[PDB]
Amino acid sequence: MEQKPGTLMVYVVVGYNTDNTVDVVGGAQYAVSPYLFLDVGYGWNNSSLNFLEVGGGVSYKVSPDLEPYVKAGFEYNTDNTIKPTAGAGALYRVSPNLALMVEYGWNSLQKVAIGIAYKV
DSSP the chain: ----TT-EEEEEEEEEETTS-EEEEEEEEEE-SSSEEEEEEEEEETTTEEEEEEEEEEE--SSSSEEEEEEEEEEEETTS-EEEEEEEEEEEE-SSSEEEEEEEEE---EEEEEEEEEE-
- 1 in any annotated domain: no
- 111 in any annotated domain: yes
Reported resolution, Å = 2.0
> 54: domain CATH number?
2.40.160.20
Experiment used for this model: X-ray
- Domain extent, residue 42, equals 7-119
- 26 in any annotated domain: yes
Number of domains in the chain: 1
- 2 in any annotated domain: no
Dist CA 37 CA 100 (whole Å): 18
Residue 18: what residue type? Answer: T
